[PDB]
């Protein structure tokens, strides 16, 4: 369209006093090909609105044209394009040449201080290119060369940082696909959780990237035995950002399946295209053991008695007594519980560890507890003044 010769012309006339980079012949090739609204390459404010939706693939020649930007502005958004924008095109072959041309603090560092790499929009590539080289070898070569470049990124982020979150976006982006191929789903959920915190403010806030990110949380939160099971899903608005159809339905039905505890629901909820992984085969029985164990704690609790028994645990989880002293013992060793189980006298003494976040029922109950404590101290305090 004419937005190249209209928006960019007004901003180059009233604002820009001189136009070294504005030429009619250079911008003529832009309108000659794509006549629609979305363009390929641009400058001034127009280039920020453009995205990869049209897949221009012209940014290789756009980087060579940055030499003309030096007479206009410094180097800011040059890092946002090229190596940072090639992730949508998914080309690991020709992208290797631009990795060795820039590197860190060679062509990007002359008169300008550190903008903190390629985090968002403006910046000069320092730690971003080194992070993408590890990502380049992540989807092509093994993970040995990828982790070697991530060691200097973790030490630098913890050393030099700022109040907001910028570098963490590019830092957790490589770790998002790094732990996906691994067998650890507990650290994979913690990585995608902090990466989602930076997705809402900026960096492709459209629902296209939100539905793709939810596929990582749905697998990690289900297999993750660390923090509850579904507890973290109801707090943060995760499921609220996606739809209920196109294989997203099994995430919403997981709430009622874990709450009720019916074993027959898990068979029809997870088909053979998912449960075929050996990870879930071991975690198939780990979902109902943790929820029913924490449920019996609040049920038997009256005042000082948290004590349980074997019949309460065996009838709840439908498990034999041989697994009562085993599966529950594994959760105790992970820091979920303190007290142990007595096999001789048939008594189960469990202490209190889990803070039980998001309750709301005990708030009205603990209100009278503070009044009872305040009355006993005040009653004994008045006797201290008399005698």
């Amino acid at each position: 369209m004419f937005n190249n010769h209209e928006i960019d012309t007004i901003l180059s006339t009233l604002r820009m006093e001189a136009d070294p980079s504005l030429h009619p012949l250079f911008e003529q090739f832009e309108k000659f090909y794509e006549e629609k609204l979305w363009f390929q390459l641009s400058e001034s404010l127009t280039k920020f609105f453009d995205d990869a939706k049209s897949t221009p693939l012209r940014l290789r020649l756009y980087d060579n044209f940055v030499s003309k930007f030096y007479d206009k502005i410094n180097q800011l958004s040059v890092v946002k394009y090229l190596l940072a924008s090639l992730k949508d095109s998914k080309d690991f072959d020709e992208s290797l040449k631009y990795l060795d041309d820039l590197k860190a603090q060679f062509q990007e560092l002359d008169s300008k201080k550190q903008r903190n790499n390629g985090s968002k929009d403006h910046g000069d590539g320092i730690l971003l290119i080194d992070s993408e080289i590890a990502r380049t070898y992540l989807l092509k070569n093994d993970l040995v060369k990828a982790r070697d470049l991530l060691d200097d990124l973790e030490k630098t982020l913890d050393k030099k940082d700022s109040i907001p979150l910028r570098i963490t976006n590019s830092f957790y982006s490589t770790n998002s696909q790094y732990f996906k191929f691994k067998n650890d789903f507990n650290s994979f959920y913690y990585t995608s959780l902090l990466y989602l915190s930076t997705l809402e403010p900026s960096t492709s806030i459209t629902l296209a990237e939100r539905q793709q990110l939810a596929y990582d949380l749905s697998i990690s939160a289900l297999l993750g035995d660390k923090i509850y099971n579904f507890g973290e899903l109801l707090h943060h608005p995760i499921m609220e950002t996606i739809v209920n159809d196109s294989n997203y339905d099994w995430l919403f039905q997981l709430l009622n399946a874990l709450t009720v505890g019916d074993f027959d629901k898990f068979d029809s909820l997870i088909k053979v295209q998912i449960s075929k992984i050996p990870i879930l085969a071991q975690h198939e029985s780990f979902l109902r053991q943790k929820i029913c164990l924490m449920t019996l704690i609040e049920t038997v609790f009256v005042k000082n008695i948290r004590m349980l028994s074997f019949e309460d645990i065996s009838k709840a989880t439908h498990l034999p007594k041989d697994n009562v002293e085993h599966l529950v013992m594994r959760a105790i060793s992970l820091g979920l519980l303190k007290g142990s189980i007595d096999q001789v006298n048939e008594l189960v003494t469990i202490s209190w560890v889990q803070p039980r976040i998001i309750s709301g029922d005990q708030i009205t109950k603990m209100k009278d507890r503070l009044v009872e404590w305040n009355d006993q101290v005040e009653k004994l305090g008045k006797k201290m003044e008399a005698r």
């Binding site: 901003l11 180059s12 009233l14 604002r15 820009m16 006093e17 001189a18 070294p20 400058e43 001034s44 404010l45 007479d71 206009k72 502005i73 410094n74 800011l76 201080k113 403006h122």
Partner: protein, 197 residues
Amino acid sequence: MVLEATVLVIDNSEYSRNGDFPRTRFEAQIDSVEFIFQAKRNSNPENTVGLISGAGANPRVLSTFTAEFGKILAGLHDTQIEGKLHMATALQIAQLTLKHRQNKVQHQRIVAFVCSPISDSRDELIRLAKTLKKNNVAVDIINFGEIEQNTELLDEFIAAVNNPQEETSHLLTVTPGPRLLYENIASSPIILEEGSS
């Protein structure tokens, strides 16, 4: 001209980060501070010039009143060029800055460069102009390309503080014609009748 205190405000917003001046105007605005500093410093041997950047970084105090440009230039390179220009909270904190001077008999003057239209409401500027008028606060407004893509939001602020040129309420507009940086303020009543230009 006479002994007075000048508070300078730099504009850093999305328009300053985009294409503005071929020299990277954010670096040229640093030279724009040097242009008015050398003019006011050569006028009187003792002068107080402050620096406050309230655009996109939230209201802050960088450097206090000083007669040297050494600490003024070094603090501008560590600022941020992103954000939005807010003149509502920038002008209110500048009134208390005027009390930082030694002798209270000095003339209170505020010189602010506005290169982008503000998104803040104009209701706070009405009660602010009436307060600055009682204390005789010289208002210097430099608008660069603001009257083209948007109307004047500071016009209501100038209308309430409106006074003859012998006291305060000086409204200026940058000429759209291309010219040198230090020449834009030369014809305007800013560095006129000073030590240098």
